C-alpha cells in the first residue's frame, strides 16, 4: 500500500527523509534536544489538501518544495543539519522555519482569466508564511498565452491546469506530463 | 535517453540553442564547486536559448516526442537585475558569479539570473551572520553547500552536494573529448 508512493519519489528525495528521520530518533533515544522534536511539523506535502483538478499545476508549481520541512524556527532548523552533516548522511533537507520566514505582500490582478493558486489549498493557518512562500506568487491561468501576458505585465508566475509554465522573469517550462499528491491521497485514505 | 532529444533541439534550430548551463560555465577553483553547485541547483540543466520563440518551439517539439519537461532561459526576454557591485566590499564573502567563468560573454544574463547577488562564505557561522544579521538579508551559501536564503529558507546535505559537484569534473574531462 504505502510503497506505491515512495516509488514515485526517487531514491534522491527519499534518502533525505530516511536521513532526516534517523537524526530525529537519535535526539530521541539520547533524550537530548527537545525543542527540535517539539517544533518539527512534517513536510509540505503532508500538511495541506486540494481538489484533484489542481493536482498537476500544484504539484509542478512546487516540484520538490513539496518536501520542505515545516519547523518552528532557525535554531531547530540548524541543529538537525549540524548532526545530519556530522553523521555524514545522504542529503538533502530544506527547512521552512516559521520563526524566520519572510514573504512579500502581493496583491493579485483583478483578472478574470486567472486565480490565485493558494486560494485553492486547505492548510493549518499556523503554517501560513510557509504555504505563502511556496505558492504565494503563482496564478493558475486560462491558457498558455494568458500566462505570457500576465507573467510579463505583472510579477507573478503563471501556470495552466495542464502544467505549462511561464515565470515572472521569462523562464519557460514545458513538456509531457504523465500521471505525487494523487497517491498521497490514496494513502491518506487508509489511515 | 532524453539528452538524445537535447541534441535534437540543437540540430533542428542550429545556431539558436546554446545548451544547458553546465556546458557554458565552470566554477573557477575546485573550492567553490560545492557552493556553486548548490546555488545553481536546477538551473544547471536549464537550456539557454536565444529567443522566447525558439524556447516555445522547443517545448512544443518536446511534447510531441513525449519527453520530460525542460526549462528554457531565452536570452531575448530574460528579465534580470544588474549585479549590486557594492556587495564586493562585504568583508567575509564574495559574490558567487565572480567565481564562475562562462562563455560566450553575452549569455551573461542567464548567469545574473541563476546567481543574482548570491554570496559565498567560508563556514556556516559566517554565512548566517551576514545573511540574517544585516538590515537587509542576503542569500548566503557556505563552502559545504548549506544555504541561507532571503526568505528564511535553510538547506543542506553536504554529502549529496559533494557527489553532485563532481559533474564539473567530468565536464572538464570532455574539454579533451
From Swiss-Prot, chain A:
It comes from the Eukaryota. Spermatocytes (at protein level). Widely expressed, with higher expression in testis and brain. It is found in: Nucleus; Chromosome; Chromosome, Centromere. Regulated by DSCC1, it is required for processive DNA synthesis, coupling sister chromatid cohesion establishment during S phase to DNA replication. Deacetylation by HDAC8, regulates release of the cohesin complex from chromatin. Ubiquitinated by the DCX(DCAF15) complex, leading to its degradation. Central component of cohesin, a complex required for chromosome cohesion during the cell cycle. The cohesin complex may form a large proteinaceous ring within which sister chromatids can be trapped. At anaphase, the complex is cleaved and dissociates from chromatin, allowing sister chromatids to segregate. Cohesion is coupled to DNA replication and is involved in DNA repair. The cohesin complex also plays an important role in spindle pole assembly during mitosis and in chromosomes movement. The flexible SMC hinge domain, which separates the large intramolecular coiled coil regions, allows the heterotypic interaction with the corresponding domain of SMC1A or SMC1B, forming a V-shaped heterodimer. The two heads of the heterodimer are then connected by different ends of the cleavable RAD21 protein, forming a ring structure. This is Structural maintenance of chromosomes protein 3. It comes from Mus musculus (Mouse). The chain holds residues 493 to 686 of 1217 of the full protein.
Swiss-Prot record, chain B:
Disulfide bonds: none annotated. The chain holds residues 499 to 675 of 1233 of the full protein. It is found in: Nucleus; Chromosome; Chromosome, Centromere. It comes from Mus musculus (Mouse). Belongs to the SMC family. SMC1 subfamily. The gene is Smc1a. Forms a heterodimer with SMC3 in cohesin complexes. Cohesin complexes are composed of the SMC1 (SMC1A or SMC1B) and SMC3 heterodimer attached via their SMC hinge domain, RAD21 which link them, and one STAG protein (STAG1, STAG2 or STAG3), which interacts with RAD21. In germ cell cohesin complexes, SMC1A is mutually exclusive with SMC1B. Interacts with STAG3. Found in a complex with CDCA5, SMC3 and RAD21, PDS5A/SCC-112 and PDS5B/APRIN. Found in a complex containing POLE and SMC3. Interacts with BRCA1, SYCP2, NDC80, RPGR and BRAT1. Phosphorylated upon ionizing radiation or DNA methylation. Ubiquitinated by the DCX(DCAF15) complex, leading to its degradation. Signal peptide: none annotated. The flexible SMC hinge domain, which separates the large intramolecular coiled coil regions, allows the heterotypic interaction with the corresponding domain of SMC3, forming a V-shaped heterodimer. The two heads of the heterodimer are then connected by different ends of the cleavable RAD21 protein, forming a ring structure. The modification N6-acetyllysine is found at residue 150. Ubiquitous (at protein level). Residues 17-131 form the SMC hinge domain. This is Structural maintenance of chromosomes protein 1A. Involved in chromosome cohesion during cell cycle and in DNA repair. Involved in DNA repair via its interaction with BRCA1 and its related phosphorylation by ATM, and works as a downstream effector in the ATM/NBS1 branch of S-phase checkpoint. Central component of cohesin complex. The cohesin complex is required for the cohesion of sister chromatids after DNA replication. The cohesin complex apparently forms a large proteinaceous ring within which sister chromatids can be trapped. At anaphase, the complex is cleaved and dissociates from chromatin, allowing sister chromatids to segregate.
Amino acid at each position: 500500500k504505502q510503497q506505491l508512493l515512495r516509488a514515485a519519489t526517487g531514491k534522491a528525495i527519499l534518502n533525505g527523509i530516511d536521513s532526516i528521520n534517523k537524526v530525529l530518533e537519535h535526539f530521541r533515544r539520547k533524550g537530548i534536544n527537545q525543542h527540535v522534536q517539539n517544533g518539527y511539523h512534517g513536510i509540505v506535502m503532508n500538511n495541506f489538501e486540494c481538489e484533484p483538478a489542481f493536482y498537476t499545476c500544484v504539484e509542478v508549481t512546487a516540484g520538490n518544495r513539496l518536501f520542505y520541512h515545516i519547523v518552528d524556527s532557525d535554531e531547530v532548523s540548524t541543529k538537525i543539519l549540524m548532526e545530519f552533516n556530522k553523521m555524514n548522511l545522504p542529503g538533502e533537507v530544506t527547512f521552512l522555519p516559521l520563526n524566520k520566514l519572510d514573504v512579500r505582500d502581493t496583491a493579485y490582478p483583478e483578472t478574470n482569466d486567472a486565480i490565485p493558486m493558494i486560494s485553492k489549498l486547505r492548510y493549518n493557518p499556523r503554517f501560513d508564511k510557509a504555504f505563502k512562500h511556496v505558492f504565494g506568487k503563482t496564478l493558475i491561468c486560462r491558457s498558455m498565452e494568458v500566462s505570457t501576458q500576465l507573467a510579463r505585465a505583472f510579477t507573478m508566475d503563471c501556470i495552466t491546469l495542464e502544467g505549462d509554465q511561464v515565470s515572472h522573469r521569462g523562464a519557460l517550462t514545458g513538456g509531457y506530463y504523465d500521471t505525487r499528491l494523487e497517491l498521497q491521497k490514496d494513502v491518506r485514505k487508509a489511515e | 535517453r532524453k539528452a538524445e532529444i537535447m541534441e535534437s533541439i540543437k540540430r533542428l534550430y542550429p545556431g539558436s540553442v546554446y545548451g544547458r548551463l553546465i556546458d557554458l560555465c565552470q566554477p573557477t577553483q575546485k573550492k567553490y564547486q560545492i557552493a556553486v553547485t548548490k546555488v545553481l541547483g536546477k538551473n544547471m540543466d536549464a537550456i539557454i536559448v536565444d529567443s522566447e520563440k525558439t524556447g516555445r518551439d522547443c517545448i512544443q517539439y518536446i511534447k510531441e516526442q513525449r519527453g520530460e519537461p525542460e526549462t528554457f532561459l531565452p536570452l531575448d526576454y530574460l528579465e534580470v537585475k544588474p549585479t549590486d557591485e557594492k556587495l564586493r566590499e562585504l568583508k567575509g564573502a564574495k559574490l558567487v558569479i565572480d567565481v564562475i567563468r562562462y562563455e560566450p560573454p553575452h549569455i551573461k544574463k542567464a548567469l545574473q539570473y541563476a546567481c543574482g547577488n548570491a554570496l559565498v562564505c567560508d563556514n556556516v557561522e559566517d554565512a548566517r551572520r551576514i545573511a540574517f544579521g544585516g538590515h537587509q538579508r542576503h542569500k548566503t551559501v557556505a563552502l559545504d553547500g548549506t544555504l541561507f536564503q532571503k526568505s528564511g529558507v535553510i538547506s543542506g546535505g553536504a554529502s549529496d552536494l559533494k557527489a553532485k559537484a563532481r559533474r564539473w569534473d567530468e565536464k572538464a574531462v570532455d574539454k579533451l573529448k
